[PDB]
Every structure is written in structure tokens, then in C-alpha cells.
Amino acid sequence: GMLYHLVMLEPEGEGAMDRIMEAMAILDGLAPELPGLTEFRHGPNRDFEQKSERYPYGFLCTFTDKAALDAYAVHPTHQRAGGMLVASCRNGADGILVVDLEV
Amino acid sequence: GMLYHLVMLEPEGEGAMDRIMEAMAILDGLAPELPGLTEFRHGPNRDFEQKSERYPYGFLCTFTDKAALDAYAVHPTHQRAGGMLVASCRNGADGILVVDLEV
């Protein structure tokens, strides 16, 4: 079963978006190197209906399967990028919403 | 200018999911008739990191542009299905998170 991994971010502090944007470039580089991560996309939340105002930025990974998601989890590039995101968000990991939709 | 429209649901009540799957079937049949809606997916949130327990189900629509999202917004068949989602979630539309990532 195919997994859409959605990560919504709550930036907090001076240089939070800058660091997040470096983390996005780090993850753009990683995606092509992981065969089970078929698509990686990121951007501002335009929130046209004003129903997610807490999360001004997010990203999406599409994985072939759970093995692919786990390969991504553990890769040193992603652990570094993940650390940077946690350092850039409100109350750390608590300012990061992660959904894993099986589609 | 491509838009990822993500809807996460908080079902509330007996028969909430039953109605949500009815609304999903409506959107499955509509998506193919909306040419700027290039992909429509949905399923349960496995939430492997326990970081989104609130939202057991969700869906993603990929739109080519804002005009495509607007065409979906105003389509009477989408509105029917969206009213069903609202009436199936906790405290109405309060139980629905909607992101629009511009990617």
C-alpha cells in the first residue's frame, strides 16, 4: 500500500523559515537517491479557506510502501533535515503535524 | 503555481464514516470530469509517529492552478460532498483541517 507522508510546520523564532528552506534543499537532494520516494514537494500554505492558519509551510512525500518510508526515516540526510525542522518549530516536535495517508 | 489541497477529517458521531465514504465516492466520480484536478486520493491516516491522532481519515486533490481549484470549489457535486463532510465532523467545519500548499 502507497503512503502520502504530509508534514505541516509551525515556524518559531528568528531565522526559522531560512533554516526550514535549507532543510527543504537538503530533502530535494535526497529524494532522487531514494527509489521508494517517488515524489517530494514543498511550499507555502496559501490556506485559501483560513482553516489551517497555524501551519504556514508544509511538504509531501509519496512512498511506494512502508519499507520506503522507513528507508527515508533512517537515512542520515533526513535525520539532519528533521533535526533542523525541530529546531525551527514551535515547541520543537510538537510544532510539526505528520499525517501518513494510505491511499 | 500547482496546488496540493489537503483535507483532514475529524469524524464525529455514529455513521460519520459511512457518510464520509459516500462523499468519497461522489468525489471519485467527479474528479475525472474536472480537467485541472489531475489527481484525487484518499485513505486512513496510519499516523505512524502518533503526531496526528485527531485526523483518522483524509484526502488530497492536486490542482494545476487556482482556476482549477476554484472550478472544483464551485462545482455543485463537490459542494454536496463537502456539506456531507462538514455534517460528519466534530463541531461541523471546526473538525476539518484544509491546507493549500503552492508547490
Side-chain angles (χ1 to χ4, degrees), chain A residues 44-52, chain B residues 1-5 7 27 30-31 34-40 59-79 98-103:
Chain A
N45 184 12
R46 304 305 187 196
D47 193 17
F48 296 117
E49 301 176 55
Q50 303 256 347
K51 304 186 68 53
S52 55
Chain B
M2 179 151 298
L3 293 159
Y4 286 28
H5 176 79
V7 183
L27 296 178
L30 179 65
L34 287 178
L37 204 183
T38 63
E39 199 175 37
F40 169 67
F59 66 91
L60 185 75
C61 312
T62 303
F63 294 101
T64 304
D65 58 17
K66 184 67 167 63
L69 169 71
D70 293 328
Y72 164 87
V74 316
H75 203 287
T77 304
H78 159 250
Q79 287 294 310
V98 183
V99 174
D100 300 301
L101 299 185
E102 185 179 304
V103 297

mmCIF file of all heavy atoms in Angstrom, chain A residues 44-52, chain B residues 1-7 27 30-31 34-40 59-79 98-103, unseen atoms left out:
data_model
loop_
_atom_site.group_PDB
_atom_site.id
_atom_site.type_symbol
_atom_site.label_atom_id
_atom_site.label_comp_id
_atom_site.label_asym_id
_atom_site.label_seq_id
_atom_site.Cartn_x
_atom_site.Cartn_y
_atom_site.Cartn_z
ATOM 1 N N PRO A 44 4.647 27.100 0.560
ATOM 2 C CA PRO A 44 3.773 27.790 1.471
ATOM 3 C C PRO A 44 2.382 27.248 1.417
ATOM 4 O O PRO A 44 1.905 26.885 0.367
ATOM 5 C CB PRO A 44 3.775 29.240 0.971
ATOM 6 C CG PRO A 44 4.364 29.207 -0.434
ATOM 7 C CD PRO A 44 5.204 27.992 -0.484
ATOM 8 N N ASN A 45 1.736 27.268 2.569
ATOM 9 C CA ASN A 45 0.318 27.060 2.690
ATOM 10 C C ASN A 45 -0.438 28.375 2.423
ATOM 11 O O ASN A 45 -0.478 29.280 3.270
ATOM 12 C CB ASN A 45 0.034 26.512 4.091
ATOM 13 C CG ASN A 45 -1.419 26.168 4.318
ATOM 14 O OD1 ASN A 45 -2.231 26.121 3.393
ATOM 15 N ND2 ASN A 45 -1.752 25.903 5.578
ATOM 16 N N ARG A 46 -1.091 28.445 1.258
ATOM 17 C CA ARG A 46 -1.941 29.573 0.908
ATOM 18 C C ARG A 46 -3.264 29.563 1.672
ATOM 19 O O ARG A 46 -3.953 30.579 1.744
ATOM 20 C CB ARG A 46 -2.216 29.555 -0.591
ATOM 21 C CG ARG A 46 -0.976 29.556 -1.451
ATOM 22 C CD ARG A 46 -0.065 30.746 -1.103
ATOM 23 N NE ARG A 46 1.042 30.843 -2.046
ATOM 24 C CZ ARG A 46 2.154 31.566 -1.858
ATOM 25 N NH1 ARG A 46 2.349 32.269 -0.742
ATOM 26 N NH2 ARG A 46 3.100 31.564 -2.791
ATOM 27 N N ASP A 47 -3.643 28.409 2.232
ATOM 28 C CA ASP A 47 -4.796 28.325 3.143
ATOM 29 C C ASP A 47 -5.946 29.221 2.723
ATOM 30 O O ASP A 47 -6.414 30.057 3.490
ATOM 31 C CB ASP A 47 -4.393 28.689 4.577
ATOM 32 C CG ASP A 47 -5.458 28.313 5.594
ATOM 33 O OD1 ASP A 47 -6.386 27.490 5.313
ATOM 34 O OD2 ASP A 47 -5.353 28.834 6.700
ATOM 35 N N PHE A 48 -6.438 29.007 1.517
ATOM 36 C CA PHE A 48 -7.431 29.896 0.938
ATOM 37 C C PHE A 48 -8.731 30.025 1.760
ATOM 38 O O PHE A 48 -9.415 31.051 1.683
ATOM 39 C CB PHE A 48 -7.727 29.454 -0.499
ATOM 40 C CG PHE A 48 -6.549 29.564 -1.423
ATOM 41 C CD1 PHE A 48 -6.011 28.442 -2.019
ATOM 42 C CD2 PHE A 48 -5.976 30.808 -1.705
ATOM 43 C CE1 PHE A 48 -4.936 28.541 -2.885
ATOM 44 C CE2 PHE A 48 -4.887 30.921 -2.589
ATOM 45 C CZ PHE A 48 -4.372 29.794 -3.168
ATOM 46 N N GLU A 49 -9.061 29.004 2.549
ATOM 47 C CA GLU A 49 -10.289 28.992 3.374
ATOM 48 C C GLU A 49 -10.068 29.329 4.847
ATOM 49 O O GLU A 49 -11.010 29.300 5.637
ATOM 50 C CB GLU A 49 -10.948 27.618 3.301
ATOM 51 C CG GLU A 49 -11.326 27.205 1.904
ATOM 52 C CD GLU A 49 -11.875 25.806 1.861
ATOM 53 O OE1 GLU A 49 -12.851 25.541 2.610
ATOM 54 O OE2 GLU A 49 -11.333 24.970 1.091
ATOM 55 N N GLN A 50 -8.822 29.631 5.199
ATOM 56 C CA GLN A 50 -8.415 30.028 6.558
ATOM 57 C C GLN A 50 -8.749 28.954 7.595
ATOM 58 O O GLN A 50 -9.253 29.260 8.686
ATOM 59 C CB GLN A 50 -9.019 31.391 6.944
ATOM 60 C CG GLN A 50 -8.669 32.542 5.975
ATOM 61 C CD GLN A 50 -7.603 33.492 6.531
ATOM 62 O OE1 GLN A 50 -7.269 33.462 7.728
ATOM 63 N NE2 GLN A 50 -7.075 34.362 5.662
ATOM 64 N N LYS A 51 -8.466 27.706 7.241
ATOM 65 C CA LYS A 51 -8.724 26.543 8.116
ATOM 66 C C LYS A 51 -7.464 25.765 8.509
ATOM 67 O O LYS A 51 -7.569 24.621 8.938
ATOM 68 C CB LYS A 51 -9.718 25.565 7.456
ATOM 69 C CG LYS A 51 -11.038 26.169 7.066
ATOM 70 C CD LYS A 51 -12.025 25.127 6.545
ATOM 71 C CE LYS A 51 -12.491 24.145 7.641
ATOM 72 N NZ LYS A 51 -13.038 24.800 8.890
ATOM 73 N N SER A 52 -6.295 26.381 8.354
ATOM 74 C CA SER A 52 -5.016 25.815 8.782
ATOM 75 C C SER A 52 -3.959 26.904 9.020
ATOM 76 O O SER A 52 -2.771 26.705 8.745
ATOM 77 C CB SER A 52 -4.509 24.849 7.729
ATOM 78 O OG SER A 52 -4.440 25.480 6.468
ATOM 79 N N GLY B 1 2.984 27.121 -9.610
ATOM 80 C CA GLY B 1 1.615 27.578 -9.235
ATOM 81 C C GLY B 1 0.668 26.411 -8.953
ATOM 82 O O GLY B 1 -0.528 26.632 -8.746
ATOM 83 N N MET B 2 1.220 25.185 -8.939
ATOM 84 C CA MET B 2 0.463 23.948 -8.701
ATOM 85 C C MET B 2 0.041 23.799 -7.239
ATOM 86 O O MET B 2 0.812 24.064 -6.335
ATOM 87 C CB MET B 2 1.295 22.743 -9.135
ATOM 88 C CG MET B 2 0.602 21.414 -8.905
ATOM 89 S SD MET B 2 1.132 19.984 -10.173
ATOM 90 C CE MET B 2 0.547 20.779 -11.862
ATOM 91 N N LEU B 3 -1.192 23.371 -7.015
ATOM 92 C CA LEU B 3 -1.784 23.407 -5.676
ATOM 93 C C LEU B 3 -2.116 22.017 -5.130
ATOM 94 O O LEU B 3 -2.869 21.272 -5.746
ATOM 95 C CB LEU B 3 -3.054 24.270 -5.694
ATOM 96 C CG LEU B 3 -2.851 25.761 -5.941
ATOM 97 C CD1 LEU B 3 -4.113 26.401 -6.426
ATOM 98 C CD2 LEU B 3 -2.303 26.456 -4.645
ATOM 99 N N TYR B 4 -1.560 21.680 -3.962
ATOM 100 C CA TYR B 4 -1.940 20.465 -3.251
ATOM 101 C C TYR B 4 -2.944 20.856 -2.154
ATOM 102 O O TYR B 4 -2.575 21.485 -1.152
ATOM 103 C CB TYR B 4 -0.720 19.736 -2.680
ATOM 104 C CG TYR B 4 0.162 18.973 -3.700
ATOM 105 C CD1 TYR B 4 0.258 19.368 -5.019
ATOM 106 C CD2 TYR B 4 0.917 17.884 -3.311
ATOM 107 C CE1 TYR B 4 1.077 18.709 -5.927
ATOM 108 C CE2 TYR B 4 1.736 17.194 -4.217
ATOM 109 C CZ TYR B 4 1.807 17.619 -5.524
ATOM 110 O OH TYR B 4 2.608 16.968 -6.439
ATOM 111 N N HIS B 5 -4.209 20.461 -2.373
ATOM 112 C CA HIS B 5 -5.340 20.729 -1.480
ATOM 113 C C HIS B 5 -5.588 19.505 -0.604
ATOM 114 O O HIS B 5 -6.062 18.481 -1.078
ATOM 115 C CB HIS B 5 -6.556 21.067 -2.331
ATOM 116 C CG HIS B 5 -7.836 21.272 -1.580
ATOM 117 N ND1 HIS B 5 -8.132 22.437 -0.907
ATOM 118 C CD2 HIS B 5 -8.958 20.510 -1.511
ATOM 119 C CE1 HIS B 5 -9.355 22.358 -0.401
ATOM 120 N NE2 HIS B 5 -9.881 21.204 -0.762
ATOM 121 N N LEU B 6 -5.246 19.632 0.678
ATOM 122 C CA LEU B 6 -5.249 18.520 1.622
ATOM 123 C C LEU B 6 -6.362 18.736 2.656
ATOM 124 O O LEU B 6 -6.426 19.790 3.305
ATOM 125 C CB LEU B 6 -3.857 18.407 2.277
ATOM 126 C CG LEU B 6 -3.667 17.359 3.372
ATOM 127 N N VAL B 7 -7.261 17.752 2.778
ATOM 128 C CA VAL B 7 -8.349 17.801 3.765
ATOM 129 C C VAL B 7 -8.271 16.660 4.780
ATOM 130 O O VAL B 7 -8.321 15.485 4.418
ATOM 131 C CB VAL B 7 -9.712 17.818 3.053
ATOM 132 C CG1 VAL B 7 -10.861 17.936 4.038
ATOM 133 C CG2 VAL B 7 -9.712 18.963 2.060
ATOM 134 N N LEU B 27 -16.833 12.236 -4.851
ATOM 135 C CA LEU B 27 -15.617 12.860 -5.343
ATOM 136 C C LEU B 27 -14.825 11.955 -6.305
ATOM 137 O O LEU B 27 -14.285 12.455 -7.283
ATOM 138 C CB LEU B 27 -14.772 13.364 -4.169
ATOM 139 C CG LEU B 27 -15.433 14.487 -3.340
ATOM 140 C CD1 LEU B 27 -14.535 14.865 -2.195
ATOM 141 C CD2 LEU B 27 -15.841 15.695 -4.232
ATOM 142 N N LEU B 30 -16.516 12.470 -9.656
ATOM 143 C CA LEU B 30 -16.394 13.879 -10.117
ATOM 144 C C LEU B 30 -14.995 14.247 -10.626
ATOM 145 O O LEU B 30 -14.875 15.018 -11.598
ATOM 146 C CB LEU B 30 -16.721 14.848 -8.963
ATOM 147 C CG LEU B 30 -16.619 16.362 -9.253
ATOM 148 C CD1 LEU B 30 -17.687 16.727 -10.311
ATOM 149 C CD2 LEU B 30 -16.784 17.204 -7.970
ATOM 150 N N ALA B 31 -13.956 13.741 -9.954
ATOM 151 C CA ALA B 31 -12.559 14.067 -10.245
ATOM 152 C C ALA B 31 -12.201 13.924 -11.727
ATOM 153 O O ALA B 31 -11.663 14.858 -12.313
ATOM 154 C CB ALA B 31 -11.588 13.231 -9.350
ATOM 155 N N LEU B 34 -13.191 16.841 -13.994
ATOM 156 C CA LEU B 34 -12.553 18.147 -13.679
ATOM 157 C C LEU B 34 -11.136 18.073 -14.177
ATOM 158 O O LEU B 34 -10.291 17.368 -13.590
ATOM 159 C CB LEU B 34 -12.570 18.434 -12.175
ATOM 160 C CG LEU B 34 -13.895 18.808 -11.513
ATOM 161 C CD1 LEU B 34 -13.760 19.008 -9.992
ATOM 162 C CD2 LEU B 34 -14.448 20.095 -12.154
ATOM 163 N N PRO B 35 -10.874 18.719 -15.332
ATOM 164 C CA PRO B 35 -9.578 18.521 -16.012
ATOM 165 C C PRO B 35 -8.360 19.157 -15.306
ATOM 166 O O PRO B 35 -7.240 18.701 -15.502
ATOM 167 C CB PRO B 35 -9.801 19.139 -17.405
ATOM 168 C CG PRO B 35 -10.917 20.100 -17.245
ATOM 169 C CD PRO B 35 -11.771 19.625 -16.086
ATOM 170 N N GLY B 36 -8.575 20.194 -14.504
ATOM 171 C CA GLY B 36 -7.478 20.773 -13.754
ATOM 172 C C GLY B 36 -7.191 20.028 -12.469
ATOM 173 O O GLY B 36 -6.196 20.313 -11.818
ATOM 174 N N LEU B 37 -8.078 19.102 -12.092
ATOM 175 C CA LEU B 37 -7.880 18.204 -10.955
ATOM 176 C C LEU B 37 -7.170 16.946 -11.445
ATOM 177 O O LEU B 37 -7.816 15.997 -11.889
ATOM 178 C CB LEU B 37 -9.235 17.861 -10.316
ATOM 179 C CG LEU B 37 -9.261 17.412 -8.840
ATOM 180 C CD1 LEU B 37 -10.655 17.067 -8.446
ATOM 181 C CD2 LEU B 37 -8.354 16.236 -8.584
ATOM 182 N N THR B 38 -5.842 16.942 -11.383
ATOM 183 C CA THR B 38 -5.035 15.897 -12.021
ATOM 184 C C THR B 38 -4.889 14.605 -11.201
ATOM 185 O O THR B 38 -4.552 13.534 -11.757
ATOM 186 C CB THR B 38 -3.621 16.410 -12.404
ATOM 187 O OG1 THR B 38 -2.893 16.779 -11.231
ATOM 188 C CG2 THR B 38 -3.708 17.599 -13.353
ATOM 189 N N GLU B 39 -5.146 14.694 -9.902
ATOM 190 C CA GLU B 39 -5.055 13.541 -9.017
ATOM 191 C C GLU B 39 -5.943 13.737 -7.790
ATOM 192 O O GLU B 39 -5.982 14.810 -7.218
ATOM 193 C CB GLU B 39 -3.607 13.319 -8.598
ATOM 194 C CG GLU B 39 -3.327 11.924 -8.073
ATOM 195 C CD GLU B 39 -1.846 11.701 -7.785
ATOM 196 O OE1 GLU B 39 -1.150 12.655 -7.308
ATOM 197 O OE2 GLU B 39 -1.385 10.550 -8.038
ATOM 198 N N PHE B 40 -6.690 12.700 -7.426
ATOM 199 C CA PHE B 40 -7.513 12.706 -6.241
ATOM 200 C C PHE B 40 -7.293 11.412 -5.495
ATOM 201 O O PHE B 40 -7.679 10.377 -5.983
ATOM 202 C CB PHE B 40 -9.000 12.830 -6.596
ATOM 203 C CG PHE B 40 -9.926 12.590 -5.427
ATOM 204 C CD1 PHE B 40 -9.963 13.474 -4.365
ATOM 205 C CD2 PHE B 40 -10.760 11.487 -5.381
ATOM 206 C CE1 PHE B 40 -10.814 13.246 -3.281
ATOM 207 C CE2 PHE B 40 -11.607 11.282 -4.302
ATOM 208 C CZ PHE B 40 -11.630 12.150 -3.272
ATOM 209 N N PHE B 59 -7.843 13.263 2.601
ATOM 210 C CA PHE B 59 -7.689 13.198 1.153
ATOM 211 C C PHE B 59 -6.887 14.348 0.577
ATOM 212 O O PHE B 59 -6.714 15.378 1.202
ATOM 213 C CB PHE B 59 -9.046 13.045 0.461
ATOM 214 C CG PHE B 59 -9.987 14.218 0.591
ATOM 215 C CD1 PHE B 59 -9.984 15.240 -0.366
ATOM 216 C CD2 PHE B 59 -10.945 14.253 1.587
ATOM 217 C CE1 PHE B 59 -10.884 16.284 -0.316
ATOM 218 C CE2 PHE B 59 -11.872 15.318 1.648
ATOM 219 C CZ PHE B 59 -11.833 16.327 0.684
ATOM 220 N N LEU B 60 -6.332 14.097 -0.603
ATOM 221 C CA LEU B 60 -5.537 15.049 -1.335
ATOM 222 C C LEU B 60 -6.093 15.237 -2.749
ATOM 223 O O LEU B 60 -6.366 14.276 -3.438
ATOM 224 C CB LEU B 60 -4.095 14.540 -1.415
ATOM 225 C CG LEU B 60 -3.140 15.534 -2.079
ATOM 226 C CD1 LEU B 60 -2.824 16.709 -1.109
ATOM 227 C CD2 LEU B 60 -1.915 14.854 -2.567
ATOM 228 N N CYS B 61 -6.263 16.490 -3.168
ATOM 229 C CA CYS B 61 -6.508 16.847 -4.551
ATOM 230 C C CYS B 61 -5.394 17.709 -5.058
ATOM 231 O O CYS B 61 -5.087 18.717 -4.456
ATOM 232 C CB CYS B 61 -7.775 17.670 -4.702
ATOM 233 S SG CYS B 61 -9.161 17.021 -3.876
ATOM 234 N N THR B 62 -4.824 17.313 -6.190
ATOM 235 C CA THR B 62 -3.781 18.032 -6.873
ATOM 236 C C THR B 62 -4.473 18.864 -7.992
ATOM 237 O O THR B 62 -5.234 18.312 -8.821
ATOM 238 C CB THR B 62 -2.798 17.009 -7.483
ATOM 239 O OG1 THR B 62 -2.294 16.150 -6.450
ATOM 240 C CG2 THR B 62 -1.683 17.670 -8.158
ATOM 241 N N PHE B 63 -4.280 20.183 -7.962
ATOM 242 C CA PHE B 63 -4.826 21.083 -8.989
ATOM 243 C C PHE B 63 -3.698 21.713 -9.775
ATOM 244 O O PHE B 63 -2.664 22.040 -9.224
ATOM 245 C CB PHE B 63 -5.690 22.176 -8.378
ATOM 246 C CG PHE B 63 -6.943 21.665 -7.724
ATOM 247 C CD1 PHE B 63 -7.011 21.536 -6.329
ATOM 248 C CD2 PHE B 63 -8.047 21.312 -8.493
ATOM 249 C CE1 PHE B 63 -8.165 21.067 -5.706
ATOM 250 C CE2 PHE B 63 -9.203 20.840 -7.889
ATOM 251 C CZ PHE B 63 -9.252 20.693 -6.476
ATOM 252 N N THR B 64 -3.910 21.895 -11.070
ATOM 253 C CA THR B 64 -2.897 22.520 -11.949
ATOM 254 C C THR B 64 -2.645 23.987 -11.586
ATOM 255 O O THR B 64 -1.551 24.490 -11.761
ATOM 256 C CB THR B 64 -3.311 22.410 -13.453
ATOM 257 O OG1 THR B 64 -3.529 21.039 -13.777
ATOM 258 C CG2 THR B 64 -2.198 22.942 -14.382
ATOM 259 N N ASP B 65 -3.681 24.657 -11.102
ATOM 260 C CA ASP B 65 -3.630 26.073 -10.787
ATOM 261 C C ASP B 65 -4.850 26.479 -9.964
ATOM 262 O O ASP B 65 -5.728 25.653 -9.700
ATOM 263 C CB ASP B 65 -3.477 26.948 -12.061
ATOM 264 C CG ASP B 65 -4.605 26.765 -13.113
ATOM 265 O OD1 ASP B 65 -5.706 26.227 -12.829
ATOM 266 O OD2 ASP B 65 -4.377 27.202 -14.266
ATOM 267 N N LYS B 66 -4.882 27.747 -9.550
ATOM 268 C CA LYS B 66 -6.003 28.308 -8.750
ATOM 269 C C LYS B 66 -7.369 28.280 -9.482
ATOM 270 O O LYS B 66 -8.403 28.103 -8.856
ATOM 271 C CB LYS B 66 -5.649 29.737 -8.317
ATOM 272 C CG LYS B 66 -6.646 30.435 -7.416
ATOM 273 C CD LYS B 66 -6.752 29.816 -6.046
ATOM 274 C CE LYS B 66 -7.508 30.752 -5.136
ATOM 275 N NZ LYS B 66 -8.892 30.961 -5.588
ATOM 276 N N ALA B 67 -7.372 28.473 -10.795
ATOM 277 C CA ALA B 67 -8.610 28.406 -11.566
ATOM 278 C C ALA B 67 -9.228 26.998 -11.466
ATOM 279 O O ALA B 67 -10.443 26.846 -11.416
ATOM 280 C CB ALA B 67 -8.338 28.791 -13.050
ATOM 281 N N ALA B 68 -8.364 25.977 -11.464
ATOM 282 C CA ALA B 68 -8.756 24.579 -11.314
ATOM 283 C C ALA B 68 -9.326 24.302 -9.916
ATOM 284 O O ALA B 68 -10.346 23.618 -9.786
ATOM 285 C CB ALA B 68 -7.539 23.679 -11.596
ATOM 286 N N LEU B 69 -8.656 24.793 -8.869
ATOM 287 C CA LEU B 69 -9.201 24.700 -7.524
ATOM 288 C C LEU B 69 -10.558 25.415 -7.395
ATOM 289 O O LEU B 69 -11.441 24.940 -6.677
ATOM 290 C CB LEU B 69 -8.235 25.261 -6.468
ATOM 291 C CG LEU B 69 -8.806 25.455 -5.044
ATOM 292 C CD1 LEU B 69 -9.042 24.137 -4.394
ATOM 293 C CD2 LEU B 69 -7.894 26.275 -4.207
ATOM 294 N N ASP B 70 -10.701 26.561 -8.040
ATOM 295 C CA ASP B 70 -11.937 27.329 -7.981
ATOM 296 C C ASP B 70 -13.078 26.606 -8.683
ATOM 297 O O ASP B 70 -14.201 26.641 -8.202
ATOM 298 C CB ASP B 70 -11.743 28.682 -8.641
ATOM 299 C CG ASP B 70 -10.780 29.602 -7.879
ATOM 300 O OD1 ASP B 70 -10.691 29.546 -6.637
ATOM 301 O OD2 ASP B 70 -10.125 30.434 -8.541
ATOM 302 N N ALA B 71 -12.777 25.936 -9.803
ATOM 303 C CA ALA B 71 -13.765 25.171 -10.581
ATOM 304 C C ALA B 71 -14.321 24.013 -9.754
ATOM 305 O O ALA B 71 -15.509 23.740 -9.770
ATOM 306 C CB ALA B 71 -13.149 24.654 -11.896
ATOM 307 N N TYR B 72 -13.448 23.349 -9.024
ATOM 308 C CA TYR B 72 -13.808 22.336 -8.042
ATOM 309 C C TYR B 72 -14.644 22.938 -6.881
ATOM 310 O O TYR B 72 -15.726 22.414 -6.548
ATOM 311 C CB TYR B 72 -12.488 21.679 -7.566
ATOM 312 C CG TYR B 72 -12.547 20.860 -6.297
ATOM 313 C CD1 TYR B 72 -12.888 19.510 -6.331
ATOM 314 C CD2 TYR B 72 -12.221 21.422 -5.067
ATOM 315 C CE1 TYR B 72 -12.933 18.764 -5.185
ATOM 316 C CE2 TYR B 72 -12.264 20.676 -3.919
ATOM 317 C CZ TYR B 72 -12.621 19.345 -3.989
ATOM 318 O OH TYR B 72 -12.675 18.587 -2.834
ATOM 319 N N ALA B 73 -14.164 24.040 -6.302
ATOM 320 C CA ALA B 73 -14.866 24.746 -5.225
ATOM 321 C C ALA B 73 -16.344 24.978 -5.527
ATOM 322 O O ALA B 73 -17.206 24.571 -4.726
ATOM 323 C CB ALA B 73 -14.194 26.069 -4.912
ATOM 324 N N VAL B 74 -16.618 25.602 -6.681
ATOM 325 C CA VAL B 74 -17.961 25.983 -7.110
ATOM 326 C C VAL B 74 -18.833 24.859 -7.730
ATOM 327 O O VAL B 74 -20.041 25.062 -7.931
ATOM 328 C CB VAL B 74 -17.920 27.231 -8.089
ATOM 329 C CG1 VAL B 74 -16.987 28.260 -7.574
ATOM 330 C CG2 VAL B 74 -17.516 26.823 -9.484
ATOM 331 N N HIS B 75 -18.248 23.711 -8.041
ATOM 332 C CA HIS B 75 -18.998 22.612 -8.655
ATOM 333 C C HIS B 75 -20.059 22.093 -7.701
ATOM 334 O O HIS B 75 -19.735 21.698 -6.580
ATOM 335 C CB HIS B 75 -18.072 21.429 -9.046
ATOM 336 C CG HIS B 75 -18.635 20.557 -10.127
ATOM 337 N ND1 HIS B 75 -19.683 19.684 -9.914
ATOM 338 C CD2 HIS B 75 -18.331 20.468 -11.444
ATOM 339 C CE1 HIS B 75 -19.986 19.082 -11.052
ATOM 340 N NE2 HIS B 75 -19.186 19.547 -11.998
ATOM 341 N N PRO B 76 -21.333 22.067 -8.137
ATOM 342 C CA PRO B 76 -22.399 21.661 -7.201
ATOM 343 C C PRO B 76 -22.231 20.253 -6.600
ATOM 344 O O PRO B 76 -22.740 20.007 -5.502
ATOM 345 C CB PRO B 76 -23.672 21.740 -8.056
ATOM 346 C CG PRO B 76 -23.193 21.767 -9.510
ATOM 347 C CD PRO B 76 -21.875 22.437 -9.463
ATOM 348 N N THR B 77 -21.539 19.359 -7.310
ATOM 349 C CA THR B 77 -21.297 17.991 -6.848
ATOM 350 C C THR B 77 -20.237 17.946 -5.759
ATOM 351 O O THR B 77 -20.321 17.156 -4.799
ATOM 352 C CB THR B 77 -20.836 17.050 -7.986
ATOM 353 O OG1 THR B 77 -21.773 17.057 -9.063
ATOM 354 C CG2 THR B 77 -20.736 15.607 -7.478
ATOM 355 N N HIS B 78 -19.223 18.781 -5.908
ATOM 356 C CA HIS B 78 -18.254 18.957 -4.830
ATOM 357 C C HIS B 78 -18.919 19.541 -3.523
ATOM 358 O O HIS B 78 -18.625 19.106 -2.381
ATOM 359 C CB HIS B 78 -17.122 19.896 -5.238
ATOM 360 C CG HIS B 78 -16.424 20.465 -4.047
ATOM 361 N ND1 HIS B 78 -16.527 21.790 -3.685
ATOM 362 C CD2 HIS B 78 -15.765 19.844 -3.037
ATOM 363 C CE1 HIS B 78 -15.884 21.975 -2.544
ATOM 364 N NE2 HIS B 78 -15.416 20.811 -2.129
ATOM 365 N N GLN B 79 -19.780 20.533 -3.716
ATOM 366 C CA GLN B 79 -20.463 21.184 -2.612
ATOM 367 C C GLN B 79 -21.355 20.239 -1.850
ATOM 368 O O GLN B 79 -21.369 20.234 -0.641
ATOM 369 C CB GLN B 79 -21.257 22.361 -3.135
ATOM 370 C CG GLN B 79 -20.369 23.502 -3.524
ATOM 371 C CD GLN B 79 -19.627 24.156 -2.351
ATOM 372 O OE1 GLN B 79 -20.216 24.496 -1.338
ATOM 373 N NE2 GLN B 79 -18.334 24.369 -2.520
ATOM 374 N N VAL B 98 -7.934 22.099 6.434
ATOM 375 C CA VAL B 98 -7.731 22.218 4.980
ATOM 376 C C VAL B 98 -6.431 23.008 4.729
ATOM 377 O O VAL B 98 -6.335 24.191 5.074
ATOM 378 C CB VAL B 98 -8.903 22.941 4.268
ATOM 379 C CG1 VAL B 98 -8.663 22.966 2.784
ATOM 380 C CG2 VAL B 98 -10.303 22.306 4.609
ATOM 381 N N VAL B 99 -5.442 22.349 4.119
ATOM 382 C CA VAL B 99 -4.210 23.000 3.679
ATOM 383 C C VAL B 99 -4.260 23.223 2.144
ATOM 384 O O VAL B 99 -4.869 22.427 1.432
ATOM 385 C CB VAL B 99 -2.998 22.124 4.088
ATOM 386 C CG1 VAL B 99 -1.714 22.677 3.524
ATOM 387 C CG2 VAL B 99 -2.929 21.966 5.647
ATOM 388 N N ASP B 100 -3.648 24.312 1.644
ATOM 389 C CA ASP B 100 -3.414 24.521 0.185
ATOM 390 C C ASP B 100 -1.959 24.864 -0.092
ATOM 391 O O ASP B 100 -1.582 26.029 -0.168
ATOM 392 C CB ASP B 100 -4.321 25.630 -0.354
ATOM 393 C CG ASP B 100 -5.815 25.300 -0.173
ATOM 394 O OD1 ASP B 100 -6.227 24.257 -0.729
ATOM 395 O OD2 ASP B 100 -6.546 26.045 0.548
ATOM 396 N N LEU B 101 -1.122 23.841 -0.210
ATOM 397 C CA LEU B 101 0.293 24.073 -0.482
ATOM 398 C C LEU B 101 0.542 24.499 -1.928
ATOM 399 O O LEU B 101 0.178 23.773 -2.832
ATOM 400 C CB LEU B 101 1.071 22.813 -0.216
ATOM 401 C CG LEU B 101 1.086 22.206 1.182
ATOM 402 C CD1 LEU B 101 2.064 21.038 1.091
ATOM 403 C CD2 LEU B 101 1.504 23.170 2.245
ATOM 404 N N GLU B 102 1.190 25.644 -2.157
ATOM 405 C CA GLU B 102 1.567 26.019 -3.529
ATOM 406 C C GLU B 102 2.988 25.522 -3.816
ATOM 407 O O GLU B 102 3.945 25.986 -3.227
ATOM 408 C CB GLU B 102 1.420 27.512 -3.769
ATOM 409 C CG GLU B 102 1.674 27.932 -5.207
ATOM 410 C CD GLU B 102 1.501 29.430 -5.416
ATOM 411 O OE1 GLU B 102 0.413 29.966 -5.095
ATOM 412 O OE2 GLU B 102 2.448 30.077 -5.912
ATOM 413 N N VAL B 103 3.103 24.551 -4.712
ATOM 414 C CA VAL B 103 4.316 23.746 -4.842
ATOM 415 C C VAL B 103 4.876 23.874 -6.248
ATOM 416 O O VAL B 103 4.564 24.825 -7.001
ATOM 417 C CB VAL B 103 4.057 22.254 -4.542
ATOM 418 C CG1 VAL B 103 3.602 22.037 -3.081
ATOM 419 C CG2 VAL B 103 3.007 21.668 -5.505
#
